């Protein structure tokens, strides 16, 4: 599997009515765990995909972020690194996703229907409990959309 299959895999979420496929998210995530040396490229791709995908797909874009984000997060706690400043590191990738997560969340909650708006709330809970993103960022989101 090479980066073109990551792009192709990610491009194929567009033919899925739901925008959700656990097998393919598991492919992306396994790939993300094998190619941290190019995490910056993986990250802006999954960041940009959430900005550009259709409206009913925005939850699955945030599922892909949750899947890669929480596996990278499980590495920094097994490896005790906070290289938030070093490219090619799991610490950097989460730092990158965090700087844009609010803009992604405001847009994803905005363009979802009530069903998907609910599942985004479930996502805010896990991230709040996992420590994936700064709690202050999620609170700004929860205080304006889920309350």
């Amino acid at each position: 599997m090479d980066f073109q299959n990551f792009v192709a895999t990610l491009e194929s979420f567009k033919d899925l009515k739901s925008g959700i496929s656990g097998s393919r998210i598991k492919k992306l995530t396994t790939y993300a765990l094998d190619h941290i040396d190019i995490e910056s490229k993986i990250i802006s791709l999954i960041i940009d995909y959430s900005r550009l995908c259709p409206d009913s797909h925005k939850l699955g874009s945030l599922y892909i972020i949750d899947s890669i984000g929480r596996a990278y997060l499980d590495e920094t706690r097994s490896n005790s690194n906070s290289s938030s400043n070093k490219p090619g590191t799991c610490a950097h990738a989460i730092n990158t996703l965090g700087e844009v997560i609010q803009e992604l969340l405001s847009d994803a909650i905005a363009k979802s229907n009530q069903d998907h708006k609910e599942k985004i709330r479930m996502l805010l809970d896990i991230w709040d409990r996992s420590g994936l993103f700064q709690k202050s960022y999620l609170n700004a989101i929860r205080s304006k959309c889920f309350a």
Binding site: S18, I20, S21, G22, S23, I25, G60, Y63, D66, S67, M122, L123, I126
Partner: peptide, 7 residues
């Protein structure tokens, strides 16, 4: 439906 497991 191949869904995403929230875990």
């Amino acid at each position: 439906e191949d869904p995403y497991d929230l875990n």
